[PDB]
Structures are given as structure tokens and as C-alpha cells.
Design a protein around this ligand. Structure first.
Ligand SMILES: C[C@H]1O[C@H](O[C@H]2[C@H](O)[C@@H](O)[C@@H](O[C@H]3[C@H](O)[C@@H](O)[C@@H](O)O[C@@H]3CO)O[C@@H]2CO)[C@H](O)[C@@H](O)[C@@H]1N[C@H]1C=C(CO)[C@@H](O)[C@H](O)[C@H]1O
Ligand SMILES: [Ca+2]
Length: 842
């Protein structure tokens, strides 16, 4: 009894969290039974575990001896039958052995840990009370109560959930109907930042500005800023952030004034809902979104297994732009196109491989480093197979359309040019040649109106895609010298068993500027792969002519199906003969004032851009300075120039967390981070040091290339400090989970930043300069909240009050200790102290 009770009931006497007690709390007893022999006065050194002497119920005080009788080598145990009395000596017997084992161990860490192991063995302290799980990527979420007396420092007047672009107002937008859902959901991974909180919005703005001024702020070098941003996980945050970020580009960079200004800071969303493009358009085209339909069309018409491949027509018409005849000087809506990304169609395929040939139950993308490399042997091998079982077919065919299509900024994926695993740019993919050739031809030849045709021939079908040449929007436009020596034609089949009859002819119209002209191949499919023609010269043997009307004509002699590691179907591309070594048909954005109330315009100048996604989730880690990506990037700034890369999308530069709780923090891509401002500052990030970063931004700028910052306002990982919140189990939309036990109940989260990281340094730091120069950003009443941002407080330290909630942590429904008689939390706040009866009054 007595000695065991609490030395005194001050906060100082307990390891508590927000003045609550957890099943893992140690405390300071009055005396310690020194070496279970005699009873000293507790000095401030003398902290013992609570469970050593108190138990939530008797039933738990039971497993506790049993389990602890194991450890210390006592060789008794009791079943459910036993009297209280015995359980109570068993435990004192257990305590002596704990001192005698603390003296002889000269510490008490060995116990820190037999305790923990045991807490873990118990339901209410363990995932079991967290079920049932749901389809959240990490199995479940906890939503934090807005109003709890128990945890008032964690209250909030916001935590408005699910305000995606479609649902920004708390009701599905009537305007946009292609996606009939509400267009996203709130909880994605880790600690969900509540971007419906006006103070937080302000802070995202702070952060945005900082990124965009990185050079000035961090290196004092105006030449090292990020030019643009990518908004990550749009469909999982409050869309207010879109007017916020849009407002900022307009106020600080003037993108709304003319295209030249707009294109120098060209920014994108990652927004998957079909509703997000029209949404963004009506919002003023202040950044551009992906073309989701065209991506899907390429995926299914070209990349999928031969038996799951669809017809080719969708390559022409399932897109934001119908490319049957695209003759518009400016497209109705701007966008970027891609076939693969760092996540889309990469990490999927790896998960496919694990699930299929390594771990059957693997969850979401919570892979191990193990599984991954195991997976990559299968994958790299399939990459070279003609019959692919996991990886894409026809990569070159997809890039041929992406790089010649009109009315979209094509984004090339690093991993389609270099190996998805492996040191930065160390190994070229089998497609690097064709892609590079296209990239280079694009600069020289791709310009003008477009026509695409789908023709049924032989036993299958082909499509033709043609670009008329610089400054001919129409088939009848005749243009000038340069028109004559520009344009291109791509011909594609998606069926290895394509056969033309002898009489069959694919008659392509190349445009008025092209009568009676010699053309030569650029790429041709061959039995083993695809053959690239780097100049007129190199292709002298294979010239062919257009006729009187500017038509190229093709025959069984040219077109037939193939099956090799590169092509499953048919690819042919032709270009006019006689273009100057240095011919360049791209075109510069004009400074003429914009008058349509949009910022970005999909015109010839925007089509002149190419975006490069310059990383891979699955890159090797650098073994040495020379291998750091940002080091390598600076050194190869010329290749990108040579490819026509105008916008370099860098990976997120935040220093990665390493808890391993998701793929992101296993391979450290930079989407999982604890410090928003720590861009390789406190230690190198996967890609190099903050200085290596600066130099790579500088290198790219030296070529005039723009550099994009991945803005990640959705979540944060691995917060160092604990906090107690009032929590509820919820699925990804924030709906309470049926039959869960965690319902408005205290939970200990990892919800606090260190108060002394970069965040502490820069949080809210420029709010003041921002309100001074751009007062209108702070005038706007944000849509979901009805009110402006609130810069009146700075976020110096993240804490649960700025979050919506968190992924379950496996701590349990009863981790915060409760008197079961009264059903009350124990509390150590000094006016209101409430302690386990035995410990205070024995
Ligand atoms: C990875 C990505 O996930 C989140 O987006 C999800 C979409 O909301 C879901 O729709 C589904 O997207 C699918 C499309 O609806 C469907 O058309 C089909 O094409 O497949 C699409 C993807 O398979 O799945 C997506 C994820 O389940 C989220 O909005 C986005 O942030 C996520 N990407 C970023 C997230 C992080 C961390 O923030 C990193 O892992 C990624 O690399 C980021 O790019
Ligand atoms: Ca969110």
C-alpha cells in the first residue's frame, strides 16, 4: 500500500500528456523498496511504472502478473479463479524482483520495456479496439472533436471536411456532372491538415510564398527561386486553397496580365475528378489540370495487355480536346497530358507484383524495402519481355501521340526514360532513344493544326495523326518556307496481327504546304524494336513522296503488326525533308494584354512547352555526393535544354520522415515529411543538400528552364510530440465507423511539432509583408468558410488544433487511463486532480 502511493500529486510527479495518464505512464512513488530489501525516500531520479502497482481493472492486473511472472523468472501463474489477495502479493513479490533487478542492472530501462511489451499484449491498448478497419490507406482514421471539455486546447471551429472542388460548398456543384460523386474525400494518409481553418490557410499561403521565393529567403540569391507549383492531392483538401494559390500567382506574378507572365510560372493541379478541369476553367485557368480522359485512352488503347486493349478511337475523341480536326488558335481549355507519373502506373504495378508473387495480403502500398527490390527483379525483367505480364506495352506509341498532339502540354516521366529503380539517370530504358528522338523532333517539326483519322484496314484498324507545319491551322492553309519543312505524321496500330490486303492504302493528307514533297522516316518499327533516324542523311535510303494534293500514301509494304519488347502493333513517324539543322518551330508567349479573363491560354506558345517529371519513387539512394539527384541535375542541365524541357517538375524537396508507415516514407520521395520548410536544410533530403538544391535551381535557370515546387498541403508525418485529443473512428469521408469503440473518446496522438524546426523559424513569417503588398488576398471571403484567411496568428508549432485528425496508431481505445468504477478520466490538472484511489489514499 503506502510506500507505493504517489510521492505528491503535482504534474511534476508523473509522465502525463496534457495532464492525463496513459497505460505507459511511469511516476514517482514516495519511497522505493531499494533492492526489494529496504525503503528509501524517492529522489527525483526515482520514477516507477504505474502498472507496477495500479491496474485499470483486476482482470488486467491479472495478465499482468502472469505475463510478468514469466520475465523475472517466477514460475507461478493464476487463472481466472484467483482471489484478489494473491494477485496483490504476486505483484509486490514482482516489485522486489524489480528493484533487485534495477540495482543489479544499474538502470531501469530493461523495465521501461517489459512494461511496454505488455501494454501491447492487451486489447484496449492495441489495434483490436480500433476495429473494424476501413478502406483508408493505413486502415483507418480518427476525427478530432471540435468541442471537448476534456481536450479544449484541441477544439476548433472548422474541420469542415470534404470540400473538394466538386463539393467546395458542402453540396455537390450542379455545374459539373461528369463525375457523379462528391469528387474526393478528406482523409488520405497520416495527420490530416485542416485546410478549412483560416489560420492554416494563411500558413499554406506563407509556405507557398516561401517556396516561390526560396532562393531569396534561404540563399539570398534571387536566381534560385521556384517559378511555379504543383498542387498535390487536390481532391483531398479544402479547395479554398485553389483561390488562395490562384490569387497569389495573380497578385505576386501577374499571370492574369498576359501569357508571357502566365507561362513563366505555369502551375498545375493533381486533380483526379473529371469535375476539376471544368471547375478550374470557370475559376479562371490560373493553373492547368491533367487530361484525365486522354490518359485513360492511351492506357487502354495502347498500354494494356493485348487481350484487354480497347479500340483506337478513344485516342482521338476521349480527351479534353477532340483531335479529329483541331484548328483552333487557342484551345477551349488548357491541360497537361501524361501516360505515367511517379505514382500513377508505377507503384500500382509494383503492388500488382507483390500481391501476385510475393505477399498476398500486402495492404494499400504499405510495402517493405524487401518486398520492393524483390518486386523489381520481376519488373525489370518484364520490362524487356515482348509479352509483358506487368508493365506497359507500346510506350513509344503513347509518347509519339503525347509529343505530337496539339492543345496540351505534354509531361514526360523520368521513369520512361531512365530505370525506375537505380541511380539518378544512371540507366536508360529501352525506349530512351525513341523518346529522345521525338523530343528533339518536336522542337523542330511539331507545329500547326492537327488532324487524326481512324481507318479500318485489313483485319484491324490504324489511326493517323498529322500536324500541318508552323502557321497552318487548316488543311488548306499553305503557309511559307518553314511550313513546308515542318509538320509530321504518326501512324499507329494497336494490334500485333495487323495485315494489310495487297490493295489496301492508308492515304494521309499532310496539308496544303506539302505537295510533291520528299518525306523521310523519324521512327520505324522493326522486328526487334524501333529504329530511330537522327537526320535526313541517316535516312537517305528510305525517302518517299507526297503527291499532287499533299497526300502521303502507305501500303502493306510499310504497315503491318509487330510484337517485340517495344511495340505491340505498329508505329511509324515521318517528317518532311530538308529542315535546317537548327530549325525550331516553337513560339514565344506574347506580352499582349489578356482579355478573356483567363490566365493560361492553350495556344501555340503554350503548346511550345514540355514538362519533365524529374524523379522516380523508386530511385536508389545515393551512395555518394556524385549521385545526388540535384547534383546530377545541375550537371546535365544541357540534355533537358536539348529535349525542349521548359518546365522541370522537381520531386518534393522536404526532408522525408522515415517511420516506414507508408511507401512514401519507406523510399523517402518527399511526400512524407515533418517539417514543411526543411528543404534539405537540417540534413540532406533524398536528392542532396539545400545547397545542392539551390545549385540545381540555378543550373536550370541558366538554361531558361522553369522549376516547379511540389506544394503538399494535405498531410504531415511523424510529429515528435504527443497530445491527447477527443477522437472518433471514421472512414475516409469522416463518417463515424459503425460498431467501432472509439467514439468521442480520449486518444493520444503524435500531434505536435518540435517548436524549433524550420517551421518554427519561418511559420507565418511573411504574412506581414504579404498583407502589405497584396491586401486583396486577405480581403477575399474563402468559399467553404465564408470568411477570409486569418493571418492574425502564426503557426509556429503544429498541434492537433490545426488538424482534422490522424490515421489510427494502434494505441487502443483505452490507452488513456480511466477509473472504471466512476467511468472517469484521471486528471492531473491542479485545481482538479483525480487519481486512482489506491495511489493517493492507501
Ligand atoms: C496517389 C494519389 O492518391 C490520391 O488520389 C486518388 C484518387 O483520388 C482516386 O480516384 C484514385 O485515383 C484514380 C482515378 O480516380 C481513376 O481514374 C484511375 O485513373 O486511377 C486513379 C489512380 O489510380 O486513387 C488516387 C489514390 O488512391 C490523391 O488525391 C493524391 O494526392 C495521391 N498522390 C499524391 C499523394 C502522395 C502523398 O500526398 C504521394 O503518394 C503521391 O506520390 C502524390 O502524388
Ligand atoms: Ca485532407
Amino acid at each position: 500500500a503506502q510506500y507505493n502511493q504517489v510521492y505528491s500529486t503535482d504534474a511534476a510527479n508523473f509522465e502525463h500528456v496534457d495532464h492525463y495518464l496513459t497505460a505507459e505512464s511511469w511516476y514517482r512513488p514516495k519511497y522505493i523498496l531499494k533492492d526489494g530489501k529496504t525503503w528509501t525516500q524517492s529522489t527525483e531520479k526515482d520514477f516507477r511504472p504505474l502498472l507496477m502497482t495500479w491496474w485499470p481493472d483486476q482482470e488486467t492486473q491479472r495478465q499482468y502478473v502472469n505475463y510478468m511472472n514469466a520475465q523475472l523468472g517466477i514460475h507461478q501463474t493464476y487463472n481466472t479463479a484467483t482471489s484478489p489477495l494473491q494477485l496483490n502479493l504476486a505483484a509486490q513479490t514482482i516489485q522486489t524482483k524489480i528493484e533487485e533487478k534495477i540495482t543489479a542492472e544499474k538502470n531501469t530501462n530493461w523495465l521501461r520495456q517489459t512494461i511496454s511489451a505488455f501494454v501491447k499484449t492487451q486489447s484496449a491498448w492495441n489495434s483490436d479496439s480500433e476495429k473494424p478497419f476501413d478502406d483508408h490507406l493505413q486502415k483507418g482514421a480518427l476525427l478530432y472533436s471540435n468541442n471537448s471539455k476534456l481536450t479544449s486546447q484541441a477544439n476548433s471551429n472548422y474541420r469542415i471536411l470534404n470540400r473538394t472542388p466538386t463539393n467546395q460548398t458542402g453540396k455537390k456543384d450542379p455545374r459539373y456532372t461528369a463525375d457523379r460523386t462528391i469528387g474526393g474525400y478528406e482523409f488520405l494518409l497520416a495527420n490530416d491538415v485542416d485546410n478549412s481553418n483560416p489560420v492554416v490557410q494563411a500558413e499554406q499561403l506563407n509556405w507557398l510564398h516561401f517556396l516561390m521565393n526560396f532562393g531569396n529567403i534561404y540563399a539570398n540569391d534571387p536566381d534560385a527561386n521556384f517559378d511555379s507549383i504543383r498542387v498535390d492531392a487536390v481532391d483531398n483538401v479544402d479547395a479554398d486553397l485553389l483561390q488562395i494559390a490562384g490569387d497569389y500567382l495573380k497578385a505576386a506574378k501577374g499571370i492574369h496580365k498576359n501569357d508571357k507572365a502566365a507561362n513563366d510560372h505555369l502551375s498545375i493541379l493533381e486533380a483526379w475528378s473529371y469535375n476539376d478541369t471544368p471547375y478550374l476553367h470557370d475559376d479562371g485557368d490560373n493553373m492547368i489540370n491533367m487530361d484525365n480522359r486522354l490518359r485513360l485512352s492511351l492506357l487502354y488503347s495502347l498500354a494494356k495487355p493485348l487481350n484487354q486493349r480497347s479500340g483506337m478511337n478513344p485516342l482521338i475523341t476521349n480527351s479534353l480536346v477532340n483531335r479529329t480536326d483541331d484548328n483552333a488558335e487557342t484551345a477551349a481549355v488548357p491541360s497537361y497530358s501524361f501516360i505515367r507519373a511517379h505514382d500513377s502506373e508505377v507503384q500500382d504495378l509494383i503492388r500488382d507484383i507483390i500481391k501476385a508473387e510475393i505477399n498476398p495480403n500486402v495492404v494499400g502500398y504499405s510495402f517493405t524495402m524487401e518486398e520492393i527490390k524483390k518486386a523489381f527483379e520481376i519488373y525489370n525483367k518484364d520490362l524487356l519481355a515482348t509479352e509483358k505480364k506487368y508493365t506497359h506495352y507500346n510506350t513509344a506509341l503513347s509518347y509519339a501521340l503525347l509529343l505530337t498532339n496539339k492543345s496540351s502540354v505534354p509531361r514526360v516521366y523520368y521513369g520512361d526514360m531512365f530505370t525506375d529503380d537505380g541511380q539518378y539517370m544512371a540507366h536508360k530504358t529501352i525506349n530512351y532513344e525513341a523518346i529522345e528522338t521525338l523530343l528533339k523532333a518536336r522542337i523542330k517539326y511539331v507545329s500547326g493544326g492537327q488532324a487524326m483519322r481512324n481507318q479500318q484496314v485489313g483485319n484491324s484498324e490504324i489511326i493517323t495523326s498529322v500536324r500541318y507545319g508552323k502557321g497552318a491551322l487548316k488543311a488548306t492553309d499553305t503557309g511559307d518556307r518553314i511550313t513546308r519543312t515542318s509538320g509530321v505524321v504518326v501512324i499507329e496500330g494497336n494490334n500485333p496481327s495487323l495485315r494489310l490486303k495487297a490493295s489496301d492504302r492508308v492515304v494521309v493528307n499532310m496539308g496544303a504546304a506539302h505537295k510533291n514533297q520528299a518525306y523521310r522516316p523519324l521512327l520505324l518499327t522493326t522486328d526487334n524494336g524501333i529504329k530511330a533516324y537522327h537526320s535526313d542523311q541517316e535516312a537517305a535510303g528510305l525517302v518517299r513522296y507526297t503527291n499532287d494534293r499533299g497526300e502521303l500514301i502507305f501500303t502493306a509494304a510499310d504497315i503491318k503488326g509487330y510484337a517485340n519488347p517495344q511495340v505491340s502493333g505498329y508505329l511509324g513517324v515521318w517528317v518532311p525533308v530538308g529542315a535546317a539543322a537548327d530549325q525550331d518551330v516553337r513560339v514565344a508567349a506574347s506580352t499582349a494584354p489578356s482579355t478573356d479573363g483567363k490566365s493560361v491560354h492553350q495556344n501555340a506558345a503554350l503548346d511550345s512547352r514540355v514538362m519533365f517529371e524529374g524523379f522516380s519513387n523508386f530511385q536508389a539512394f545515393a551512395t555518394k555526393k556524385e549521385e545526388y539527384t540535384n547534383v546530377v541535375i545541375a550537371k546535365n542541365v544541357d540534355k533537358f535544354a536539348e529535349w525542349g524541357v521548359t518546365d522541370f517538375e522537381m520531386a518534393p524537396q522536404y526532408v522525408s520522415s522515415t517511420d516506414g508507415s507508408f511507401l512514401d516514407s519507406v523510399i523517402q520521395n518527399g511526400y512524407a515529411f515533418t517539417d514543411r520548410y526543411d528543404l534539405g536544410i537540417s540534413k540532406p533530403n533524398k536528392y542532396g543538400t539545400a545547397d545542392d538544391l539551390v545549385k540545381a535551381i540555378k543550373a536550370l535557370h541558366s538554361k531558361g528552364i522553369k522549376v516547379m515546387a511540389d506544394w503538399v498541403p494535405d498531410q504531415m508525418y511523424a510529429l515528435p510530440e504527443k497530445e491527447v485529443v477527443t477522437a472518433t473512428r471514421v472512414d475516409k469521408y469522416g463518417t463515424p465507423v459503425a460498431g467501432s469503440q472509439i467514439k468521442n473518446t480520449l486518444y493520444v496522438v503524435d500531434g505536435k511539432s518540435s517548436g524549433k524546426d524550420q517551421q518554427a523559424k519561418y511559420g507565418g513569417a511573411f504574412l506581414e509583408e504579404l498583407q502589405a503588398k497584396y491586401p486583396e488576398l486577405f480581403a477575399r471571403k474563402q468559399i467553404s468558410t465564408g470568411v477570409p484567411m486569418d493571418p492574425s496568428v502564426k503557426i509556429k508549432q503544429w498541434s492537433a488544433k490545426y488538424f482534422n485528425g490522424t490515421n489510427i496508431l494502434g494505441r487502443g481505445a483505452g490507452y488513456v487511463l480511466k477509473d472504471q468504477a466512476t467511468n472517469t478520466y484521471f486528471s492531473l490538472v491542479s485545481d482538479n486532480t483525480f487519481l486512482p484511489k489506491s495511489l493517493v489514499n492507501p
